[PDB]
């Protein structure tokens, strides 16, 4: 059968390696960008690549492989790190001036780390039907006897480290049963490495598509005329017996199946019209999911002024408006000499941020450092990079997250076909969504649902 696949990011790229290995080779893959990987994407930041999206394998260490570890630390040999977060006691900062007392801190992460234990006890004796889940929140709330969670500015940034800088929504929007404890780690392990290679982190699905695609054998890039740059798909009309799908070039196309990877965020926007209109029941699905946002700013100095050394990788700022510029990381191991600091904000800070200039947020950041570092002489920074995911209309955000209302029968919708249309993408992962190895096996399965109504008509 002919498949056209909406998407060249990572999902889209292992559907159709998926397809090919069962035979389905008349595949048409159509991206809206000019380059295929999607949410792996890397940048020139002060003469050095950066990630823009993902830049860590997570979950590695444990009872099972994570399926992408092998392929960066062994196929591709990416140079990586594994990060270590044990140090973070000596390093958060006050709101003005200087670090907090080292041992005040270990204790107020222990009893974050306890209460997040009692979660994990108590996520474990909820129904499957989800009838009795609860935020995050709710369950801070229930096993530390207050009517609020983390308050105080040093246990708000610590907990906004545990929770938004995983998820990217605050633990009272996140559903405490599809997250605590995530099938991530307790599959693949507690470990992360992150990705710091010039050719980036999407050079694994450039590896995945050299599998099946045609490359040049000088240049190494892709030339079969099965993948499409630049097609935006802006139509997909489906009937019983095929589809035709209309790019934003005024091209069409037709195919007796599509694959949508676009991301959840994507689907929730209407770039994509269906026609007919999707059911009531998947329409439903898509909006009570959340699609996140997650802003990693780089910055530049002329020169370094803040710690380096065992333990200074990670450092986080406690503002007593929460989440306001509060995670940083610094390179030493991996960008040495370069000066650069990267700090992370997500949700509303994401939003408000991409919405004003990036003059306007290094100033502000500015501001921030000054308070942290009072005894530097701070320069300002030379130059600054601010990721606009959520604004931009073939994204609409970073990866998804999973809301305290949603249960599993109703996260499955997602991942439902409507006729002749599929649906794939890491917010179909079943237990992963939200990572680029969830975004990797989405494609694998999503791709086996098709076979398997395609050709045994076992739908
Ligand atoms: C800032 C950020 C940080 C993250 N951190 C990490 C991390 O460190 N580790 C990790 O494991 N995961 C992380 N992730 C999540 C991970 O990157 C994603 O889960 C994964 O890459 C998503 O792949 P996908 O194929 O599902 O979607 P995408 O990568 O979005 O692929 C969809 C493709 O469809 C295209 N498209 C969209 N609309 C259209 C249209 N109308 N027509 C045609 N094509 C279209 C897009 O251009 C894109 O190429 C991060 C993501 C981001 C953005
Ligand atoms: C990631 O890959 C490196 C690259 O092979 C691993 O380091 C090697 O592992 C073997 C295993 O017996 C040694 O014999 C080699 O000497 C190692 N090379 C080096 C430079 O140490 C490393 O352990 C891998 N990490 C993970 C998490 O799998």
């Given at each position: 059968?002919?498949?056209?696949?909406?998407?060249?990011?990572?999902?889209?790229?292992?559907?159709?390696?998926?397809?090919?290995?069962?035979?389905?080779?008349?595949?048409?893959?159509?991206?809206?960008?000019?380059?295929?990987?999607?949410?792996?994407?890397?940048?020139?930041?002060?003469?050095?690549?950066?990630?823009?999206?993902?830049?860590?394998?997570?979950?590695?260490?444990?009872?099972?492989?994570?399926?992408?570890?092998?392929?960066?630390?062994?196929?591709?040999?990416?140079?990586?790190?594994?990060?270590?977060?044990?140090?973070?006691?000596?390093?958060?900062?006050?709101?003005?001036?200087?670090?907090?007392?080292?041992?005040?801190?270990?204790?107020?992460?222990?009893?974050?780390?306890?209460?997040?234990?009692?979660?994990?006890?108590?996520?474990?004796?909820?129904?499957?039907?989800?009838?009795?889940?609860?935020?995050?929140?709710?369950?801070?709330?229930?096993?530390?006897?207050?009517?609020?969670?983390?308050?105080?500015?040093?246990?708000?940034?610590?907990?906004?480290?545990?929770?938004?800088?995983?998820?990217?929504?605050?633990?009272?929007?996140?559903?405490?049963?599809?997250?605590?404890?995530?099938?991530?780690?307790?599959?693949?392990?507690?470990?992360?490495?992150?990705?710091?290679?010039?050719?980036?982190?999407?050079?694994?699905?450039?590896?995945?598509?050299?599998?099946?695609?045609?490359?040049?054998?000088?240049?190494?890039?892709?030339?079969?005329?099965?993948?499409?740059?630049?097609?935006?798909?802006?139509?997909?009309?489906?009937?019983?017996?095929?589809?035709?799908?209309?790019?934003?070039?005024?091209?069409?196309?037709?195919?007796?199946?599509?694959?949508?990877?676009?991301?959840?965020?994507?689907?929730?926007?209407?770039?994509?019209?269906?026609?007919?209109?999707?059911?009531?029941?998947?329409?439903?699905?898509?909006?009570?999911?959340?699609?996140?946002?997650?802003?990693?700013?780089?910055?530049?100095?002329?020169?370094?002024?803040?710690?380096?050394?065992?333990?200074?990788?990670?450092?986080?700022?406690?503002?007593?408006?929460?989440?306001?510029?509060?995670?940083?990381?610094?390179?030493?191991?991996?960008?040495?000499?370069?000066?650069?600091?990267?700090?992370?904000?997500?949700?509303?800070?994401?939003?408000?941020?991409?919405?004003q200039s990036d003059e306007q947020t290094k100033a502000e950041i500015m501001q921030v450092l000054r308070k942290m570092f009072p005894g530097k002489d701070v320069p300002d920074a030379t130059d600054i990079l601010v990721p606009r995911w959520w604004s931009d209309?073939?994204?609409?955000?970073?990866?998804?997250?999973?809301?305290?209302?949603?249960?599993?029968?109703?996260?499955?919708?997602?991942?439902?076909?409507?006729?002749?249309?599929?649906?794939?993408?890491?917010?179909?992962?079943?237990?992963?969504?939200?990572?680029?190895?969830?975004?990797?096996?989405?494609?694998?399965?999503?791709?086996?649902?098709?076979?398997?109504?395609?050709?045994?008509?076992?739908?």
């Amino acid at each position: 059968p002919r498949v056209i696949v909406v998407g060249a990011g990572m999902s889209g790229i292992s559907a159709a390696k998926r397809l090919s290995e069962a035979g389905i080779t008349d595949l048409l893959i159509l991206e809206a960008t000019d380059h295929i990987g999607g949410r792996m994407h890397k940048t020139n930041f002060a003469g050095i690549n950066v990630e823009l999206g993902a830049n860590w394998v997570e979950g590695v260490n444990g009872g099972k492989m994570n399926p992408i570890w092998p392929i960066v630390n062994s196929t591709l040999k990416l140079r990586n790190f594994r990060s270590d977060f044990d140090y973070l006691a000596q390093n958060v900062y006050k709101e003005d001036g200087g670090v907090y007392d080292e041992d005040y801190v270990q204790k107020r992460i222990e009893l974050a780390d306890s209460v997040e234990e009692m979660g994990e006890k108590l996520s474990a004796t909820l129904h499957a039907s989800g009838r009795d889940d609860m935020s995050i929140l709710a369950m801070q709330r229930l096993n530390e006897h207050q009517p609020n969670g983390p308050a105080t500015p040093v246990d708000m940034v610590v907990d906004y480290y545990k929770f938004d800088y995983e998820f990217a929504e605050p633990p009272r929007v996140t559903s405490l049963q599809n997250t605590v404890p995530l099938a991530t780690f307790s599959d693949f392990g507690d470990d992360v490495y992150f990705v710091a290679d010039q050719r980036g982190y999407e050079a694994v699905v450039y590896y995945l598509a050299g599998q099946y695609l045609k490359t040049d054998d000088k240049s190494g890039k892709i030339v079969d005329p099965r993948l499409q740059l630049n097609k935006v798909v802006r139509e997909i009309k489906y009937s019983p017996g095929g589809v035709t799908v209309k790019t934003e070039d005024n091209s069409v196309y037709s195919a007796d199946y599509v694959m949508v990877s676009a991301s959840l965020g994507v689907l929730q926007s209407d770039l994509i019209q269906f026609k007919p209109k999707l059911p009531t029941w998947k329409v439903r699905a898509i909006y009570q999911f959340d699609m996140a946002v997650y802003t990693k700013i780089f910055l530049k100095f002329p020169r370094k002024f803040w710690p380096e050394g065992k333990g200074r990788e990670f450092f986080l700022y406690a503002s007593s408006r929460r989440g306001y510029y509060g995670v940083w990381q610094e390179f030493e191991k991996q960008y040495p000499d370069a000066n650069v600091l990267l700090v992370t904000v997500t949700d509303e800070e994401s939003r408000r941020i991409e919405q004003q200039s990036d003059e306007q947020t290094k100033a502000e950041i500015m501001q921030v450092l000054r308070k942290m570092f009072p005894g530097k002489d701070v320069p300002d920074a030379t130059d600054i990079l601010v990721p606009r995911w959520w604004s931009d209309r073939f994204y609409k955000g970073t990866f998804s997250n999973w809301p305290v209302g949603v249960n599993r029968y109703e996260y499955d919708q997602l991942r439902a076909p409507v006729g002749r249309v599929y649906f794939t993408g890491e917010h179909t992962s079943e237990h992963y969504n939200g990572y680029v190895h969830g975004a990797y096996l989405s494609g694998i399965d999503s791709a086996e649902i098709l076979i398997n109504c395609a050709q045994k008509k076992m739908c």
